[PDB]
Structures are given as C-alpha cells and as structure tokens.
C-alpha cells in the first residue's frame with residue numbers, strides 16, 4: 027500500500043497482470059498544503075511547477091513499485107510543457123507508472139515508464155521519465171571522486187580570494203536573475219555561489235534551513251530544485267548571456283540519484299561544470315555533505331530559448 | 343546670441359529690464375536627432391528623461407547668460423516630476439532662466455532655471471540654480487587627487503583579496519535590469535568595484551562604449567553615466583531588495599565640469615554614498631588619470647517603494 031504525502035494524494039487505478047502492471051496516482055496541486063509549494067518560480071508573473079515536483083512523485087511511485095516487487099534513479103527526465111498552478115479549483119496532476127515483463131519475471135524488473143499529465147478531462151501532457159532500480163556502482167565511483175570534487179571546490183574559492191571569480195551572496199544572486207524569474211521564497215536556498223564564467227563552473231553552498239519545507243515527501247521539491255538552480259545560474263549569470271534576449275531553461279536530465287536525506291536543517295555543497303554552448307548544454311551536478319556524497323545529477327540538460335518567445339508561450 | 347544644439351532648439355523669449363532679465367528656450371524632445379537621447383532609461387516599459395538632460399540645457403543657458411554679462415555650476419538641482427518622452431508629435435520642453443539684480447547687472451553670479459513641458463502647460467519637471475562660480479573648489483579638488491586615487495587603489499586591492507564585488511559592464515546592468523533597462527548609449531559603465539559596507543564605489547566609465555552624435559554643453563549620456571555609479575552603489579547592496587525598494591535620482595547640491603567629457607575616452611569615477619528619512623547623499627568625483635574632470639557635491643538619492651514608483655509612472 028503506497029503512502030500518501032504532500033505531493034501524492036490518492037491512487038486512481040492500480041492493475042497487476044501477466045506481462046505488466048499500471049499504477050495511476052493523482053495530486054490536486056490546488057490542495058492547500060501543496061499549492062504554495064507547486065508554485066516554484068514566477069516568470070512574467072506566471073507561476074510554474076518545477077521538474078523537481080515530478081521527480082519527487084517519481085521517486086515515490088518508483089520506491090513503492092520496487093518494494094512491492096536499493097536506489098531509485100529518476101532517469102531520462104523530459105519536461106515538454108509548462109504546468110501553471112492556477113489555484114482556482116481542482117487541478118489534477120496524474121502520474122502513470124507502467125511496467126512490462128515476460129512471464130514469471132516480474133521480480134526481475136529494473137525500470138518503469140512514468141508520465142505526468144494534468145486532467146480535468148485530459149488537460150496537458152507535461153513530462154515523462156523512466157525510474158530505474160539501479161545498482162550502487164555509481165555511488166561507489168562517486169565516493170572515490172570526493173577528494174577530486176573537493177579540490178575543484180577549493181580551487182574556485184582560491185580563485186575568488188585572488189579576485190579571479192565572482193562570488194554571489196544569496197540575495198544578490200537572486201537579484202541578478204530577477205528579470206528572468208522570481209522564486210518562491212521557500213526555493214531561495216542558494217546561500218552563496220562562486221562562478222568561474224570561463225568554464226560555466228560553479229561551487230555553491232545550499233542551505234535548506236533558509237526556507238520553510240513543511241510536509242511529507244520523498245525528495246522535497248524545493249531542495250532538489252535548489253540543486254539544479256546552481257547549474258542554471260552558472261549558465262545565465264555569464265557576462266555574455268543577455269537574459270533580456272536569451273535564457274537557459276530547464277530541459278530535463280539523464281539521471282538523478284539521492285544517497286542521503288535532504289535535511290531541512292542542513293547546508294550542502296554543490297559543484298557543477300556545465301558544457302559550452304545546437305541549443306542544448308549539459309553537465310553533471312554533485313551534492314556533498316562534507317566528505318559524504320549526497321546526490322548526483324548526470325547529464326542535467328539546459329536549453330537556450332529566446333526570452334520573448336518564452337514569455338509568449340507562457341502567456342498564451 | 344545663444345547657439346542652438348541637439349538639446350536646445352530655439353529661443354522663445356528674451357527680455358531685459360532694469361532689475362533683471364528672462365530667457366526662455368525650447369526643445370522639441372520629439373525631434374528626430376534628440377528623441378532617442380531623451381529616452382535615457384526604461385522603467386516598467388516607460389521611457390524617462392534623465393536629470394542630466396536638464397543639466398546640459400542649464401549649462402548652455404548659464405554659459406550664454408554669463409558671457410552676455412569662468413565655471414558654471416548647475417546647483418540646487420531638484421527633480422520633481424518624471425518626463426516621459428512619448429515620441430508622438432511635438433513635446434515641447436521649455437527652459438526658463440531668470441536673473442535679478444539691484445540697480446549692477448554685470449555683478450550677477452546666479453540665475454534661477456525652470457524646466458517644464460508645454461503642449462499649453464503640461465507638467466513642471468525640475469528646477470536648478472546656475473552659479474557663475476570661483477575656481478576655489480577646483481583648486482581644492484586638485485590637492486585631493488592623490489587622496490581620491492588612494493581610495494580607488496584600496497578598492498581594487500580589496501577586490502584582489504576577495505573582499506569587494508567587481509562588476510563587469512553587462513553583469514552590472516543585468517543586476518539592475520528588473521529596476522530599469524538603459525538606452526544602450528547610456529550603458530557606459532565599463533566596470534565597478536563596490537565596497538557594500540560603505541556604499542563606496544570606484545568605476546571606469548568609458549564613453550567610447552556608446553554613440554553620442556550631436557552638439558551639447560555636457561552630453562546627457564556622459565553625465566548620467568557619472569551619476570549611475572552612485573545609484574548602483576546604493577541599489578546593488580545585498581540588503582536592498584529592488585523588488586520592494588529602490589534608490590532613485592533626486593537631484594544634487596552642486597555640479598561642475600572642468601574638462602570636456604570626450605566621447606573617445608574613459609574616466610575614473612569614485613563615490614562614497616552616505617548610510618540610509620528617505621534620502622542619502624554623497625560626493626562623486628571624476629578623474630582622467632591625474633586630472634580633475636568633474637565633481638558632484640551632495641548628489642542626493644531617494645528611497646521609494648518599487649511598486650509605488652510603478653503606479654506613478656503608469657498613470
């Protein structure tokens with residue numbers, strides 16, 4: 027029996043069969059405990075749900091599906107269409123998980139397809155991902171790289187201390203981005219960020235104590251979004267990116283794994299080196315707690331879009 | 343008689359009497375050579391004329407009045423109401439200079455100047471007092487050059503140790519972009535080093551970074567770029583939330599220019615603005631290496647609610 031949370035409200039349909047199974051859950055993003063959280067960013071006055079909102083639900087339905095048959099990877103995340111939480115009556119986000127398997131091999135299953143769509147009935151298809159019941163091989167490799175990530179972080183701080191790189195305090199960083207997007211205060215968790223613009227390379231302290239995070243989640247959408255904001259800032263805070271004309275927006279990612287809880291009283295270190303500018307850039311994002319590996323995005327992908335075209339799409 | 347320029351288009355009236363004189367000039371800010379320049383900044387999509395636009399005209403009518411009767415100080419500048427250059431047919435900015443004297447005209451060392459748009463009266467925008475001043479301030483400033491250069495060097499030393507922020511041109515304007523977007527011809531701040539704890543800034547302003555075609559006494563983009571250093575030093579503080587409160591131009595006590603503001607040259611600008619009534623003030627010096635180029639004394643900024651600013655402009 028799957029547990030309901032702030033971001034997963036009820037089971038719509040659940041069906042187990044010979045060559046597969048379906049699980050459909052529903053979240054009313056207008057419900058009072060979640061509607062504030064569902065409004066992660068505001069672009070041209072229009073609220074937007076963040077990809078981390080889907081990722082939280084994906085982790086929940088993946089963890090449940092796995093246990094009914096131990097890391098869940100939220101992989102192949104593709105965000106296709108904006109979700110605008112209007113807060114004017116029910117707004118039903120349905121998450122459909124499907125699995126396939128050959129006879130008597132249900133227990134071997136290591137992935138499931140997940141789709142996110144709003145309904146009234148069908149409203150919009152928003153996003154999709156593949157949850158993977160994955161090995162700890164990546165975690166083991168990341169643990170061997172900790173000293174290397176730490177050295178990259180130390181080198182960024184050394185360069186700032188010599189006047190080489192920019193260091194943004196929290197409020198100044200969000201001010202720099204404010205003509206592009208204004209954040210829900212509960213999402214404004216970047217305490218500082220050191221940016222080497224030449225390599226789109228950033229080290230950031232993210233402090234989850236800086237916001238309110240009441241509810242139950244698998245991975246708090248504000249905590250996970252704050253991790254991806256480091257990569258977004260590294261791109262859009264470059265002196266040669268004119269955010270009046272072109273901006274790097276979320277596109278999705280290849281892989282996302284969490285190895286330790288994202289604790290609302292703690293601060294974490296985040297490091298990324300995003301690739302150089304088709305219209306896509308990608309890179310990895312690691313999250314540390316001192317010497318411990320906390321989480322990792324592999325192939326986080328951002329897309330360069332015209333600022334005005336973004337505005338027209340959202341307003342329509 | 344008075345020369346016409348990009349920012350001063352014709353004489354409306356010129357009268358002398360035994361105890362004074364009046365000079366009224368007119369500028370159609372919709373004329374095609376000046377309308378672009380008149381649009382200095384955009385706030386919430388609404389174009390605004392900068393105080394430096396008035397200062398340029400004030401220098402012109404002051405220099406003229408004066409030679410007719412040798413530094414002009416544009417002093418006691420008060421900006422009361424926004425001027426929005428709509429670009430939809432004539433928009434006539436009238437500048438009125440008045441002098442008074444006891445029965446003695448050649449002794450006169452100041453004149454009152456008013457700036458108002460007419461259709462006839464539209465809006466009263468600003469006023470100042472032009473002063474025909476001594477070189478005492480210039481000579482005192484020349485003795486302080488090494489002290490100003492030391493303040494600038496200390497800011498650069500602090501940034502090189504990671505203590506102060508240094509903004510490249512485009513990143514500086516990006517930081518301010520939710521408050522105002524600038525006419526590219528006004529985006530002349532090449533870099534700025536900010537000590538936030540004292541609202542203290544040193545900036546390189548490079549007039550070659552914009553286009554400045556026309557004739558002026560003091561190019562309004564060049565003078566506005568000087569004041570932007572002080573505005574940035576206030577609004578770029580980490581504790582100023584420009585979504586709620588912003589420091590806007592208010593005016594100044596005194597402004598003198600000692601050397602041409604050359605559109606091929608870069609200059610050094612230094613200011614230490616006071617700590618946060620709703621007003622802050624400070625001095626702004628402009629250097630060309632070892633030479634004193636210009637000085638604002640008592641440049642005044644006013645803290646206003648960002649949304650109240652929006653409503654006022656929108657109406």
Ligand SMILES: Cc1cc(CSCc2cc(CSCC(=O)NCCNC(=O)CCNC(=O)[C@H](O)C(C)(C)COP(=O)(O)O)no2)no1
Nearest residue numbers: 067107108109199200203207216255258259262275276339
């Ligand atoms: C300090 C600090 C750090 C940062 C982060 S850097 C600046 C920044 C801000 C944001 C948030 S706003 C962009 C965003 O992606 N938000 C959520 C994602 N939500 C969607 O809804 C898009 C996907 N949607 C689409 O609609 C389409 O693909 C679209 C409209 C982009 C184009 O479609 P097409 O043109 O092909 O028709 N991110 O980075 N800030 O401060």
Ligand SMILES: Cc1cc(CSCc2cc(CSCC(=O)NCCNC(=O)CCNC(=O)[C@H](O)C(C)(C)COP(=O)(O)O)no2)no1
Nearest residue numbers: 383422423424425514515518522531570573574590591654
């Ligand atoms: C690098 C780098 C540098 C910068 C720029 S520096 C930061 C900055 C930018 C601005 C520009 S916008 C504010 C401004 O003052 N613009 C012109 C002045 N023009 C008026 O029209 C006010 C007139 N004042 C009024 O109308 C009223 O007094 C009002 C409405 C403000 C108050 O209302 P009241 O209460 O009196 O009714 N400024 O600083 N960027 O990157």
